[PDB]
Each structure stands twice: as C-alpha cells, then as structure tokens.
Amino acid sequence: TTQNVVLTKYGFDKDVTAIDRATDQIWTGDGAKPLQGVDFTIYNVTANYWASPKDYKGSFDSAPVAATGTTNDKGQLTQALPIQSKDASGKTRAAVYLFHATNPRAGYNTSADFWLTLPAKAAADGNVYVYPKNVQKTTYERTFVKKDAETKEVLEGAGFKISNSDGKFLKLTDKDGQSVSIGEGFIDVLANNYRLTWVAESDATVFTSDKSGKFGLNGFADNTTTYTAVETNVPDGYDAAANTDFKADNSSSDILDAPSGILP
Ligand code: NA
Ligand code: NA
Ligand code: NA
Ligand code: NA
Ligand code: NA
Ligand code: NA
C-alpha cells in the first residue's frame, strides 16, 4: 500500500520567502515560476529515523534510494511510496522519506532537505503535496555587438570563444553535462537550463554574432572574474579583432573588426 507524493518546485524572487504549507493543500504558486528539469532523490530513511526518532536530524547515511525523478514543465514530480517500511532490526514501521535535490535549476541554489512520515495528510484527490524551498541566486550576463570598424555597421557571423585566466575555454552543456548545439546570438542559459564548463580550446563552444551583431550569454556566477573573448572565426574580408577582456557585469559593448586592406 502506497501514497502518491506530488512534489512541486516553484521559483521565487530572491527576497520573497514562502510560508509552510500542509501536505493536503494544492498550491498554485501565486504565480511563481514552476521550475522544470530539477532532479530529486528520495531516500528511504525509515531505519535512520526509527533508530532514535527524537534524535533524527535528516541523515540519509546508508539509506536506500526509494526513487529518483525530475520536475516537468509544471515543476512537478510524482512518485508512489510505500506507507510502511522496515527499521534496521527488521521491524515494520511507518515509512519515512527524505527528499534531496541533486541538480538544481540554473540560477538557483539547491533546495533544503526535508522529510516526512507516511501515511501523511492528503488532499481531496488523495495526493500528498510537497513544495521544496530554495533561494534564487544572483547571476550575471554579458553582451557583445560585433561591428565593422570602418562603417560602424553590425557584422553577422563572427565566431568567438571565451577563456578564463587558467587558459581554459567555455563549453555549454545541458543539465546532465552533455553537448548541445549552440547557434547565433545571445544564449539564454537560464531559460534553457544549461551549464558553463571549462575545457580545452578545441572542445569549446563557439558563439556567433547574429544579424544585429549581437552575441553573449547569461548565467555567469560572478561579476568580478575576468574572461577573454577571442575571435576564432573571422568574416571573410576582415581582420580579427584584438582579444577583449571583460567581466560579466550585465553590460553590452562593441567589438570592432577592421576590413582587410587590399593594395595594388
Ligand atoms: Na536525482
Ligand atoms: Na536507512
Ligand atoms: Na510496528
Ligand atoms: Na536542473
Ligand atoms: Na536538498
Ligand atoms: Na551565439
């Protein structure tokens, strides 16, 4: 015999704190953003808890995995869980489950671990509703406009790589670390739930100026680190721009490409 636990992850403004809600309350978020693609492990902590209930403080040491999952487009993750389970001595008990975020949405801190006993108070539909809490982090972005140095008009199709002070280069991956194909323009890492990794130059992501000359991305961790934009694919008939040092300071600035001279 099991109960359906429905986990819903909402994203909140940095300075707004959610009130606790009972497990029999169906809460729309009012209308905070549902967070898709968030990974949770549910641990069966029945044995850890019943070792000494008054001392339990959220340990999942040696606890088996009851289930894993990922939030969907509604920020939701559903899982049927046995209401009873065994303690360390093989005695049957009311089951205790601990919910552990293993991969938070880009731009968010990991949720706090929480746990509960089953059977729990359920909503009118028979489901048990939980709502993990976390804090949105402040991330930063940078935009560049590629231009013709002579005409001052924007330049489409110029390719760039980005390096850090270690000489490693930026590669965008999906939430699971896999490669992704990146096109032209400003890349919305936050909306796409991408990750910034630092790799060898040959494996780096190439960013390309779009029809308005624009390229760049959001999702930088800080605004103090210096990075370097290096032009790797120069439009035909131009000379490469000098390397451009920058901070992810939410600004936009121009990068100039000089037309190649032709002599008689
Ligand atoms: Na997981
Ligand atoms: Na355990
Ligand atoms: Na018992
Ligand atoms: Na994620
Ligand atoms: Na957690
Ligand atoms: Na791009």
Author numbering: 39 to 302
Wording from the paper:
As the first reported host of “non-pathogenic-derived” pili, Lactobacillus rhamnosus GG is a gut-adapted commensal lactic acid bacterium (LAB) and one of many clinically investigated probiotic strains for human use in the prevention and treatment of certain gastric ailments. As with other Gram-positive bacteria, sortase-dependent piliation in L. rhamnosus GG (called SpaCBA) is assembled from the ~30 kDa SpaA (backbone), ~20 kDa SpaB (basal), and ~90 kDa SpaC (tip-located) pilins. Two immunoglobulin (Ig)-like subdomains comprise GG-SpaA, each having the conserved residues of a canonical E-box motif and internal isopeptide bonds formed between either lysine and asparagine or lysine and aspartate residues. Our findings show that the GG-SpaA structure has certain features in common with other pathogen-derived pilin-proteins, such as the Ig-like CnaB-type folds and the presence of internal isopeptide bonds6940.
